Write a protein that binds this ligand. Structure first.
Ligand SMILES: Cc1c[nH]nc1CN1CCN(c2nc(-c3[nH]c(C)c4c3CCCC4=O)cs2)CC1
Length: 126
């Protein structure tokens, strides 16, 4: 079995920006979710080989994880906050697509997503 290449975290062809909203996404949103007791499954791309999930990347064609998001923020990969918010939402949605309601991993995603929503509700104006 094989994992796909991880999502890119650098691309010199892609225009970059640092905005106050992106700074908030790193210092408040990512930091809060990253330290949570349920963060660990989301801190790296899913290793479908080690986890014996040979169907994971048959079902999930837009993988995303907080380790990737963290690196994208640190490397100023994004142009705007909406790009980064979309990556978070992709991560949560993938979890709900692949797994079953009530699975431990879904309960963990739901706890992180509640906090995500609480923080982005106070995203500062640009
Ligand atoms: C040792 C350590 C401490 N902190 N971080 C680490 C390194 N990694 C350690 C392994 N790990 C892991 N993720 C998962 C994981 N994740 C998602 C989003 C999953 C799954 C399985 C089910 C379906 C699913 O949707 C399993 S094992 C991720 C992090």
């Amino acid at each position: 079995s094989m994992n796909p290449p991880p999502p890119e975290t650098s691309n010199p062809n892609k225009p970059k920006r640092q905005t106050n909203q992106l700074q908030y996404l790193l210092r408040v949103v990512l930091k809060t979710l990253w330290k949570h007791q349920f963060a660990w499954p989301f801190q790296q791309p899913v290793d479908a080989v080690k986890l014996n999930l040979p169907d994971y990347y048959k079902i999930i064609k837009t993988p995303m994880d907080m380790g990737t998001i963290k690196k994208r923020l640190e490397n100023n990969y994004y142009w705007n906050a909406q790009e980064c918010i979309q990556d978070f939402n992709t991560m949560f949605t993938n979890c709900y697509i692949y797994n079953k309601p009530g699975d431990d991993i879904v309960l963990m995603a739901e706890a992180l997503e509640k906090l995500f929503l609480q923080k982005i509700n106070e995203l500062p104006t640009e």
